Design a protein around this ligand. Structure first.
Ligand SMILES: NC(=O)c1ccc[n+]([C@@H]2O[C@H](COP(=O)([O-])OP(=O)(O)OC[C@H]3O[C@@H](n4cnc5c(N)ncnc54)[C@H](OP(=O)(O)O)[C@@H]3O)[C@@H](O)[C@H]2O)c1
Ligand SMILES: NC(=O)c1ccc[n+]([C@@H]2O[C@H](COP(=O)([O-])OP(=O)(O)OC[C@H]3O[C@@H](n4cnc5c(N)ncnc54)[C@H](OP(=O)(O)O)[C@@H]3O)[C@@H](O)[C@H]2O)c1
Lengths: 258, 245
């Protein structure tokens, strides 16, 4: 009821950030985990670090922006888990910081492609694998940016809106198939995604600091504070929860004028 | 204050349905309207009908899925309006009815391309014409399917969720340039089985008419609607308000 012992999981983008915390969380609870990123060297250091802790994790290098690579990854995962998937976490995603009128066609292709299209497409080709397990969970990762507008990430927000709506549809269409579908939508979590952005441009430093002051709790979240909810939603204890988007944001989205 | 006299408007997909009604409504209240569709003879009979009833309306054929044709359309709109656009109504849209697991890449490209990308790209390049008018308005068409899940239209819902979010971002960024951006999200407006079900779900017990949507789009463009930005308003006969009736 509160264990993932003997479950199979695919977590996309698990070499850093929230994704690293998620594979360590599910694998600690007893899941067989498979993950992926775009740097084999980085992916390798992870597999060794995880192998040293007694965590049962596998992985391969995959750019999720390519349809044929998504097709291949799922073949691998089907062979390794023997045609059975319990959990799919569509964690991987990217952000680009510009004004709404400056985003290009290529930015559009990068953001919607990895943040929405890849995530949705994996959910499609995973369906039969999750169905065959009879206890399937699809978790998408949204954002506070999928609630109200934030500066410099308009096109990112749009992609998180597609995710939020896609969550509801899959939840209703697949519930009869014993698959539950939810999104976890973080506040500011201090990861590479934010550190790279604020290193690049001190205007992004500004914006982030002001997201944290807006956060009633007055601090950025920790990756594990997000993976904890992601783990819970996969517990059989969570068997009536589907179609939900839940913010883990320190009260950010509850805050109107504080 | 309740006048659109001497405004300039671009509404996409004005050759039928809600887009037709919006052209007539906006033009009937004094706006100069530019519109487009995908075939000459359909677009041309509208242009003939609207001119006979004294409406000030122009139009050209465009495929909103081509980025080159979107650029060329905005350059043409820029020419005829003299660099000044008050109103942009992103009306054009499509639906494909499949199960979530069945939608192909072509489906994705048509539905996301038409509903979100074209609506977004047009907004990017209209921006200086709207900024120049010093009284801008961009309006997206959303859907009840961008509120909660409906059968057969998962990928379409997603494209409306993206629109909902973009109308908040654009509203917040462009508010200083006096451009206001809102979405109108209709319910069923005039798969039978499915549509029949949605209608008994809407408290008013009937499907809407096109001019029940355009009425709201016209008001949102009035100077009277000056403090209203970043909203999504469902014109749905109560559909979204109803949990269990
Ligand atoms: N950090 C925050 O404050 C925050 C807030 C709200 C929501 N989120 C969401 O949380 C998720 C992860 O964010 P994060 O902060 O953990 O990001 P991150 O630190 O930048 O890590 C992203 C992970 O995804 C992988 N990835 C990205 N694109 C990939 C691709 N095309 N193919 C394969 N792998 C790919 C990256 O690997 P490579 O670098 O090797 O490619 C990396 O392993 C995203 O959906 C993000 O939108 C984050
Ligand atoms: N009808 C409803 O019940 C309903 C409900 C909720 C939301 N909506 C939204 O309302 C908007 C209009 O819906 P509608 O029912 O009036 O649609 P419709 O009857 O299908 O008309 C769409 C219009 O857009 C044009 N169009 C479509 N694709 C185009 C393209 N690629 N390039 C150029 N023009 C294009 C079509 O022209 P051509 O045929 O000549 O190409 C047509 O004039 C859409 O955004 C839809 O999402 C409608």
């Amino acid at each position: 009821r509160w264990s993932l012992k003997g479950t199979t999981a695919l977590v996309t983008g698990g070499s850093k950030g929230i994704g690293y915390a998620i594979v360590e969380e599910l694998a600690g609870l007893g899941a067989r985990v498979y993950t992926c990123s775009r740097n084999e060297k980085e992916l390798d250091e992870c597999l060794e670090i995880w192998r040293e802790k007694g965590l049962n994790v596998e992985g391969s290098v995959c750019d999720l922006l390519s349809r044929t690579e998504r097709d291949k990854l799922m073949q691998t995962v089907a062979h390794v888990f023997d045609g059975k998937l319990n959990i799919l976490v569509n964690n991987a995603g990217v952000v680009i910081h510009k004004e709404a009128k400056d985003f290009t066609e290529k930015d559009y292709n990068i953001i919607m492609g990895t943040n929405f299209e890849a995530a949705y497409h994996l959910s499609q080709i995973a369906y039969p694998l999750l169905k065959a397990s009879q206890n399937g969970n699809v978790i998408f990762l949204s954002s506070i940016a999928g609630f109200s507008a934030l500066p410099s990430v308009s096109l990112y927000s749009a992609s998180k809106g597609a995710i939020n709506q896609m969550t509801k549809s899959l939840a209703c269409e697949w519930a009869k198939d014993n698959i539950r579908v939810n999104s976890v939508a973080p506040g500011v979590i201090l990861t590479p995604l934010v550190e790279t952005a604020i290193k690049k441009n001190p205007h992004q430093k500004e914006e982030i600091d002001n997201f944290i002051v807006k956060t009633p709790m007055g601090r950025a979240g920790k990756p594990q504070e997000v993976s904890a909810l992601i783990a819970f939603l996969c517990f059989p204890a969570a068997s009536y929860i589907t179609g939900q988007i839940i913010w883990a944001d320190g009260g950010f989205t509850a805050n109107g004028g504080f």
